[PDB]
Ligand binder design. Sequence first.
Ligand code: T05
Ligand code: T05
Lengths: 197, 195
Amino acid sequence: SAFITFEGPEGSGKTTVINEVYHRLVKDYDVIMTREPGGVPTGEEIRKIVLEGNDMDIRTEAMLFAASRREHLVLKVIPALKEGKVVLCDRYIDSSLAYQGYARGIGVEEVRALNEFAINGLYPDLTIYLNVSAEVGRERIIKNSDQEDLKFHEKVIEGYQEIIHNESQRFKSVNADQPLENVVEDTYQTIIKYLEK
Amino acid sequence: SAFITFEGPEGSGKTTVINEVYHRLVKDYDVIMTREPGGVPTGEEIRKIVLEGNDMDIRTEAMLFAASRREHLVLKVIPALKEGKVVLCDRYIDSSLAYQGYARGIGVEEVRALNEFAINGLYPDLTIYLNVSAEVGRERIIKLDQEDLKFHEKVIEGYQEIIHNESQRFKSVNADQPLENVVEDTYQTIIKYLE
Ligand SMILES: Cc1cccc(Oc2cc(S(=O)(=O)N3CCC[C@H](n4cc(C)c(=O)[nH]c4=O)C3)ccc2C(=O)O)c1
Ligand SMILES: Cc1cccc(Oc2cc(S(=O)(=O)N3CCC[C@H](n4cc(C)c(=O)[nH]c4=O)C3)ccc2C(=O)O)c1
């Protein structure tokens, strides 16, 4: 079994990359792709609270992402891993670290402690980081489309770089500035290398 | 202003005590009584999840109590304290430590770390622990089965562990006494602190 997560800011081509990689991997592996809340009832109810939030306190928001994360992990991820599957998960702990911890300013360490309570030692075996420059990301969120939104996007990227610097061994950075066909190929090759070894 | 929490197992007389102490304190202080979620919209929505169906994982439950706790603190407790109020809060961090941490078996240290994330340094100025024996508590509950009795005993064992890592904020009141005495001791403990 293997638990692989995908991370990156908006404009990194993430959703498109995970979908294409998943379509290629199913040919050779027993794999599922999911994301939180991923249809788990309590997680879906938590998502409604988050989306209905009127200027929600950032720590309450971080706890709701963590509670949805645990429900999705216990009811969906863990049973698939026990069946020997490869699980591809679109966003996991590192999204809370980059967004809630770094960009929103709670602190990466504090958000990590909250998430360790939620995941109870179940870190990913491998995390693909779709490394898009702030400039390319900005353009992918202009062509397919504010100073405070641009500043937030830059802060999310800065947060992912701090996370990757501190836990390099768990991450594989993929150049997401390339055309999407190349990003897909590099991501697929990185995953097969890990799965075959 | 003062943030005062009340803790204890079921059958400790906690409801009677808070209400009676509120009626005495209102003569001299601008006092409010509250409990989580306490009417805060997001907290009320979290409470509906906890109550309205699931076999729910104990850690998800602990995180929902902590999220409701933060919403109640930020939208209800902190604004009342800024108005100079004495806030009497029925259950706070120590209930998660005794119930989720100890009795449900997640671990008190794990639950404390989760709750410190939720309260971000806002510990009570004073916490009244209504120290009832399991036997007296069980008699007040009837005024249940083996599983329920053992869980109640485990909650009390949990509070003893928390109160063992004692000092300053915690004030233990003998809740085995008749309720008029528990109320008097609680009121006198609170006035001593406030004055
Ligand atoms: C309970 C729950 C879990 C996941 C999503 C969700 O709801 C949404 C939030 C947004 S978003 O714009 O808030 N944002 C998009 C960028 C990534 C963000 N993110 C993600 C994770 C997993 C995290 O841990 N922290 C964090 O900030 C969320 C956008 C869309 C949705 C939706 O599912 O429709 C609610
Ligand atoms: C979101 C939220 C917060 C508070 C209550 C709530 O909903 C209830 C849960 C129960 S209970 O039987 O689960 N239980 C009763 C004994 C004390 C228990 N307790 C309390 C706290 C504050 C804690 O941190 N941990 C913990 O275990 C809860 C009983 C009644 C209700 C209701 O309000 O109707 C939901």
